[PDB]
């Protein structure tokens, strides 16, 4: 499925894994995908989140509260949670439906919003960003 990602979308999921590693987490969850969308910094997703006041620090602090730092450094490559896999599958479906041949950062964020139930979704709400508007603020930047 990675063959369909833009270079920057690829960067998002690489950074998501890096963030999971830094937190001593054993899975790449939707929350790590969220962190990766922010870390990527340049894409429509990063800009949408920045413009809705959703910060790397805000997300990190919520993840620390909800999940917490793990004790032991995990392996090099960390598997996705089932919910994160579902978000990536939905990201493809967003892009297809919108007539886009590639999956960009925008589509990963749209996919996350569409799944709408994982840790990332919970964090976004705790930080006062209703998921509906994230969709709005996104497709608008588009």
């Amino acid at each position: 499925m990675f063959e369909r990602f833009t270079d920057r979308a690829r960067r998002v999921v690489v950074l998501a894994q890096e963030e999971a590693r830094m937190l001593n987490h054993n899975y790449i969850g939707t929350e790590h995908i969220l962190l990766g969308l922010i870390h990527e910094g340049e894409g429509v997703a990063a800009k949408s989140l920045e413009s809705l006041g959703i910060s790397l620090e805000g997300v990190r602090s919520q993840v620390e509260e909800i999940i917490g730092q793990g004790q032991q450094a995990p392996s090099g490559h960390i598997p996705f949670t089932p919910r994160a896999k579902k978000v990536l599958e939905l990201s493809l479906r967003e892009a297809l439906q919108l007539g886009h041949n590639y999956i960009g950062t925008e589509h990963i964020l749209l996919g996350l919003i569409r799944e709408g139930e994982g840790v990332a979704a919970q964090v976004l709400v705790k930080l006062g960003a209703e998921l509906t508007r994230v969709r709005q603020q996104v497709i608008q930047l588009l």
């Binding site: 499925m1 990675f2 690829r10 999921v13 690489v14 490559h77 598997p79 996705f80």
Partner: peptide
Amino acid sequence: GLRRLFADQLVGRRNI
């Protein structure tokens, strides 16, 4: 990859 056993090239893990 999108599963569990060993390292994908970039991100995640895969099964045989």
